[PDB]
């Protein structure tokens, strides 16, 4: 019920300009979710919008410490010809200076009749952005982030991270996620810089005393007040992908 409670920001977000006096974070520039030759429409609430590689998502008008969720489709020209690529659910995490997208696909083109989709299902985390926190200016001490990990079909997955600025150390949990084997440890890692100097941390996730995968996350605003990015979790004969978003209490 409260999840499911994101105000009117939807038709909003579609059809209304950026205003940096809206609550933040007040703007994601996508990348990740719609590659340089393709478009991608994003509909919810009566309205619709279409966004291309660079475009900005007015995530001023959404609600914060909610999932958003937009039915997309992706487009693009082949050989004289509009193609739908992919159909699905665009899911985005708002919190107050970073926000993580992931894509749940329902259908993708068939491959042997590109006009018609076919059904098939994939969940991947995309674009993660907002007011990157500088690895040159960190905050001093000890930050412990609290915040939601969501994964295809399950928005109800918790986060829970520890980092230590002076050590440059972190690590964490993933807890709550009906799929158990998701629920991984976000083992010890560094806190460095990336290519963009901006704080980052780079590690393993474990389950069963083992390596299942890797997690990314990056961290967002002047004391760090925030993380946010994703997991990869192989479980069986499968990799899942987890959207993790968190912030200081
Ligand atoms: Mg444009
Ligand atoms: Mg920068």
């Given at each position: 019920?409260?999840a499911?409670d994101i105000?009117?920001?939807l038709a909003?977000?579609?059809?209304?300009?950026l205003?940096?006096?809206?609550?933040?974070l007040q703007?994601?520039?996508?990348?990740?979710?719609v590659?340089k030759?393709?478009?991608?429409?994003?509909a919810?609430?009566?309205?619709?919008?279409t966004?291309?590689?660079?475009?900005?998502?007015?995530t001023?008008?959404?609600?914060?410490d909610?999932?958003?969720r937009?039915?997309?489709?992706r487009?693009?020209?082949?050989?004289?010809?509009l193609?739908?690529?992919?159909?699905?659910?665009?899911?985005?995490?708002?919190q107050?200076?970073?926000a993580?997208?992931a894509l749940?696909?329902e259908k993708?083109n068939?491959?042997?009749?590109i006009?018609?989709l076919?059904?098939?299902?994939?969940?991947r985390?995309?674009?993660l952005?907002?007011?990157?926190?500088?690895?040159?200016?960190?905050?001093?001490?000890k930050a412990e982030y609290?915040?939601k990990?969501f994964?295809?079909?399950?928005?109800?997955?918790?986060l829970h991270?520890?980092?230590?600025?002076?050590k440059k150390?972190?690590?964490?949990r993933?807890?709550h996620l009906?799929?158990?084997?998701?629920?991984?440890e976000?083992?010890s890692a560094?806190?460095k810089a990336?290519?963009?100097?901006?704080?980052?941390?780079?590690?393993?996730?474990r389950?069963?005393?083992?390596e299942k995968?890797?997690?990314?996350?990056?961290?967002?605003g002047?004391?760090?007040?925030?993380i946010?990015?994703?997991?990869?979790?192989?479980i069986?004969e499968?990799?899942?992908?987890?959207?993790i978003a968190?912030?200081?209490?």
């Amino acid at each position: 019920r409260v999840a499911a409670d994101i105000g009117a920001g939807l038709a909003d977000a579609l059809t209304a300009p950026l205003d940096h006096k809206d609550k933040s974070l007040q703007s994601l520039t996508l990348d990740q979710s719609v590659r340089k030759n393709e478009k991608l429409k994003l509909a919810a609430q009566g309205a619709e919008k279409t966004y291309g590689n660079g475009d900005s998502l007015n995530t001023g008008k959404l609600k914060n410490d909610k999932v958003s969720r937009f039915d997309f489709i992706r487009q693009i020209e082949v050989d004289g010809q509009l193609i739908t690529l992919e159909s699905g659910e665009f899911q985005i995490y708002k919190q107050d200076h970073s926000a993580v997208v992931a894509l749940q696909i329902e259908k993708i083109n068939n491959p042997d009749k590109i006009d018609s989709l076919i059904n098939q299902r994939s969940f991947r985390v995309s674009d993660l952005g907002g007011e990157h926190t500088a690895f040159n200016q960190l905050p001093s001490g000890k930050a412990e982030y609290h915040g939601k990990a969501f994964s295809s079909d399950d928005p109800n997955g918790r986060l829970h991270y520890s980092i230590d600025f002076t050590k440059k150390q972190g690590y964490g949990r993933i807890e709550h996620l009906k799929t158990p084997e998701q629920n991984v440890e976000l083992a010890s890692a560094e806190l460095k810089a990336d290519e963009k100097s901006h704080a980052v941390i780079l590690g393993d996730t474990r389950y069963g005393g083992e390596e299942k995968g890797t997690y990314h996350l990056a961290l967002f605003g002047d004391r760090a007040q925030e993380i946010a990015g994703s997991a990869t979790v192989k479980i069986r004969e499968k990799v899942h992908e987890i959207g993790i978003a968190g912030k200081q209490l």
